């Protein structure tokens, strides 16, 4: 709680003031320490105000309570060589709050206690009540060694710490002073769009996947999606010589993000760039319950998997806004339908609808957002509760017989996922009773996940002038048994692979299957050549397609990727592809 700050002489010791722990921040007044280190056995100054005479150690200003202008307070005066004495008084207004009590030298920084009973200010400097009006921050002195070539930094400050909104702009501002060629990577377009506003005044340029490269020759920062970067690498004839790459929300495990990390890592290793991965949950994360800006109530209890008729009154009785993470769109459809039956206003989020739907979570009003894992990647909600059954679907490449991709599960999420889901709330210092309602244990092992080998399909097909095959980022290499370069395509097969993903909008595995079979982009025969069991279903109907040349054919692909038909947007897109319009 309250600590005496002593100064060591040659053989003596004297009190020079008073400070307050919380934790994990030690608070005192500037003139007491002058920014020097203190130790109970070291505490380093991380935030200071010289004009108002305040300083804090170990983090930002924790004590945000203030005097209500009316009531009594207690100065917990810690006088040197004297016992701690509580003295009650009534402060007055002069605008500055001040006490009329006088204590002798060495008592400066003594806590003035609320009724009852947080600290509302510090005694010292009528005698003024000195109190900060700020939240954090603490202060981000940008370490210049993060800009050295062949250096990769993982910026892993907890969720809400301010990586995106506070540290990233600072770094970009600093990198622009150093005249570095900077690339910023955002997980989704809407998130990038948010970043665009927070980087106001700066020369940032948003880059779309419809353009393969875009060089201005001006001092300019490129902003783009993880996936846009990867797509440009597969298609552009220009090497992008950025010497600083910042990937934000670097926990994203979609194949394009994984491949991007590997390429950025290869670029660091070659010596051509510095790299920064921003995520509280880097590869290998085990902790599902990380630090938050505000206290979280972690509530464990049964959560419905589908529509419910009774026994979950706690879901709908709750009086704030809820973010509910579902394993799939279909599971989301069931949950959303059930909530709307009770007259609840729900917004549904998925990868393909994120761009249109997520903006609405800001400029409309709602009770529930029902989302897939996509909301783990920097999606901000002004909500008080997360419902997290800690469940997801996992794409898996089956080799038992003919090669296909299935969505396995629902299965438990990684610890990293659970943390990012939980991490949606507790982010607001002014709101202290956010809830994380969850069910089940998370699961580390996801070696059978299709995204890692798909990442290698992307990687194996990016060529560098140095002749080096880009490989998975270090911590991620164990997640596939795939051999470096085994997925490398060349000539027309390579070009068709890229095109099937870029314009065809097909998954990586499927695009690779079709292209390496020697099929041209515009040839769609394979969408109808599949066996009996490959018949695609939609809303309980066998899908039939009206082809390019006017034939009515059953949708029955040679290669079966569950992702083209498990996602209703992907099915609609795939039907257009099979038809030859795409």
């Amino acid at each position: 709680g309250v600590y005496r700050i002593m100064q060591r002489g040659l053989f003596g010791k004297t009190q020079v003031g008073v400070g307050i722990h919380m934790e994990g921040v030690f608070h005192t007044m500037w003139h007491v320490t002058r920014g020097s280190v203190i130790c109970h056995e070291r505490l380093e100054p991380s935030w200071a105000d010289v004009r108002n005479d305040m300083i804090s150690y170990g983090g930002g200003w924790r004590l945000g309570d203030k005097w209500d202008k009316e009531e009594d307070v207690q100065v917990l005066a810690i006088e040197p060589g004297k016992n701690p004495k509580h003295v009650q008084t009534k402060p007055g207004l002069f605008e500055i709050g001040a006490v009329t009590l006088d204590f002798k030298p060495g008592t400066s920084g003594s806590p003035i206690i609320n009724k009852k009973g947080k600290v509302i200010g510090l005694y010292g400097n009528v005698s003024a009540i000195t109190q900060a009006e700020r939240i954090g921050e603490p202060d981000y002195e940008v370490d210049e060694d993060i800009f050295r070539k062949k250096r990769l930094t993982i910026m892993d400050l907890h969720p809400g710490a301010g990586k995106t909104k506070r540290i990233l702009p600072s770094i970009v501002r600093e990198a622009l002073k150093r005249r570095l060629r900077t690339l910023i990577l955002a997980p989704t377009r809407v998130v990038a769009a948010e970043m665009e506003e927070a980087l106001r005044g700066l020369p940032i340029r948003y880059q779309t996947p419809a353009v393969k490269s875009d060089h201005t020759g001006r001092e300019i920062v490129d902003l783009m999606c993880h996936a846009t970067f990867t797509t440009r690498l597969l298609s552009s004839t220009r090497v992008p010589n950025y010497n600083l790459i910042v990937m934000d929300e670097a926990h994203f495990t979609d194949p394009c993000s994984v491949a991007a990390r590997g390429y950025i890592s290869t670029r660091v290793e070659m010596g051509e760039a510095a790299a920064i991965f921003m995520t509280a949950t880097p590869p290998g994360s085990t902790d599902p319950f990380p630090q938050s800006n505000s206290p979280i109530e972690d509530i464990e209890r049964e959560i419905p998997e589908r529509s419910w008729n009774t026994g979950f009154d706690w879901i709908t009785d709750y009086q704030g806004k809820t973010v509910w993470f579902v394993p799939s769109i279909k599971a989301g459809n069931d949950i959303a339908n059930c909530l709307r039956k009770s007259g609840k206003r729900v917004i549904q989020l998925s990868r393909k609808t994120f761009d249109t739907e997520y903006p609405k979570t800001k400029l409309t009003d709602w009770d529930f957002v029902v989302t897939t894992d996509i909301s783990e990647m920097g999606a901000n909600f002004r909500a008080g509760r997360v419902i997290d059954p800690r469940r997801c679907l996992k794409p898996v490449i089956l080799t038992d017989g003919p090669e296909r991709v299935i969505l396995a599960g629902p299965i438990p999420v990684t610890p990293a996922s659970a943390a990012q889901r939980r991490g949606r709330i507790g982010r607001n210092p002014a709101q202290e009773d956010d809830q994380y309602v969850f069910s089940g244990d998370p699961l580390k092992n996801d070696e059978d996940h299709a995204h890692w080998t798909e990442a290698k399909m992307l990687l194996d097909n990016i060529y560098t002038p140095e002749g080096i095959i880009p490989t998975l980022f270090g911590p991620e290499r164990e997640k596939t048994q795939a051999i470096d370069g085994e997925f490398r395509l060349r000539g027309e097969q390579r070009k068709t692979f890229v095109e099937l993903m870029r314009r065809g909008d097909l998954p990586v595995w499927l695009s690779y299957k079709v292209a390496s079979a020697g099929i041209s982009y515009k040839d769609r025969e394979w969408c109808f050549t599949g066996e009996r069991n490959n018949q695609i279903l939609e809303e309980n109907m066998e899908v039939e397609i009206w082809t390019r040349e006017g034939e009515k054919k059953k949708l029955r692909p040679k290669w079966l990727d569950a992702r083209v038909y498990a996602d209703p947007m992907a099915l609609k897109d795939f039907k257009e592809f099979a038809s030859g319009r795409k």
């Binding site: 309250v2 002593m6 130790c39 917990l76 701690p84 600290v119």
Partner: peptide, 14 residues
């Protein structure tokens, strides 16, 4: 002129 800390009391009323 090194700086160290010593406990005094806890943050409380009365």
């Amino acid at each position: 002129a090194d700086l160290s800390l010593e406990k005094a009391a806890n943050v409380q009323w009365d």
